[PDB]
């Protein structure tokens, strides 16, 4: 539940770039997150949690652009 | 539950860049986070949590841009 | 639950850069965080937590930009 | 956005009564309430607010029952 | 945004009564309340707020019951 | 945003009563309350606030019960 607002992003002879909560080359395994969570008289059971992640880029001469400007 | 607001991002003969809570080349394993969490008369059980992560970039001549401007 | 506000980010013949709580080349394993967490008459049990993380960049001639400007 | 849950309300030779957030003989005028309200880059204007309320019961021998049991 | 939970309200040869956040004979005028309210880059204007309330019960021999048991 | 939890309210040859944040015979005028309120880069203007409240019960032989048991 994220809110993103941008009023009047004006650019003239320039660059108005903006990159929010971006993931790039990220490996996550068996993680638990909780935001704005309410438990009232509740029960929760959970067994073994097994997770494995991997991010392997073998790269050369890459131009990656998640938002913004790249002039090469 | 994050809120991102930007009013009048104006640029002229320049650069207005902005990068928020970005992850890049990040490895997370078996982590637990809690933000704004309320437990009321609740029970929670959890078994073994096994996690493994890996981020390996073998790279040369990379131009990565998550927001902003890159002029090369 | 983070709040990001920026009013009138104006740039002229210059650079207005901003990078918030960014992670880059970060390895986390079996960590527990708690922000604004309330326990009321609650029980919580947890088993063995096993985690392993790794971030290995073997790199040369990289131009990484998470927000801001990079002119090379 | 209220939640009301009742599990196994059992009664035997007795009374299981329950009255939640009830109003009775209540007068409200020109009040403003806000619960879980989020304003993001918003404008709000409001003129004169004129309100008048009145609750007048001229009564005798009344048996009022909002939930529960009344044995007279 | 209130939560009401009741597990196993059992009664035998007795009374299990419960009255939550009840108003009775209450007069409110020109009051402002705020619970869990977030303002982000917002403007709010408000004019004169005029309010008047009144609760007048001229009563005799009344049996009022908002939840619970009344045996008379 | 109030939370009300009750587990196993059992009664036998007795009384299990419970009254939470109840108002009765309460007069409020031009009051301002704030709970868990966050202002970020926000403006708020407010004019004259005029309020008047009144609670007048002229009563005899009243049996009022907001939760609990009344045996008369």
Numbering used by the authors:
A (entry chain C), B (entry chain A), C (entry chain B), D (entry chain F), E (entry chain D), F (entry chain E): 1 to 72
What does the paper say about this structure?
Different posttranslational modifications have been identified at multiple sites of α-synuclein, influencing its conformation, aggregation and function. In this study, we focus on α-syn S87, which can be modified by both phosphorylation and O-GlcNAcylation.
For pS87 sample, 2D classification identified two different fibril morphologies, including the straight filament polymorph (~74%) and the twisted filament polymorph (~26%). Besides, we managed to obtain the high-quality density map of the twisted filament with an overall resolution of 2.6 Å. The pS87 twisted filament features a half pitch of ~154 nm, a helical rise of 2.41 Å, and a helical twist of −179.72°. In the pS87 α-syn fibril, α-syn adopts an arch-like fold in the fibril core, composed of residues M1 to T72 folding into 7 β-strands (β1-β7). Unlike the gS87 and unmodified WT α-syn fibrils formed under identical condition, the entire N-terminal region participates in fibril core formation in the pS87 fibril. While, the phosphorylated S87 is excluded from the fibril core, and remains flexible and invisible from cryo-EM. Starting from residue 73, the extended C-terminal region (residues 73-140) remains highly flexible in the fibril structure, without electron density. In the pS87 fibril structure, residues 1-29 from the N-terminal form a U-shaped structure stabilized by two pairs of salt bridges, including K6 & E20 and K21 & D2. Meanwhile, V3 and M5 on β1 establish hydrophobic interactions with residues L38’ and V40’ from the neighboring chain, forming intermolecular interactions that bring the two protofilaments together. The second U-shaped structure is formed by residues 30-49, stabilized by a salt bridge between K32 and E46 and a hydrogen bond between K34 and Y39. β2 (residues 26-29) forms a steric zipper-like hydrophobic interaction with residues 52-55, connecting the two U-shaped structures.
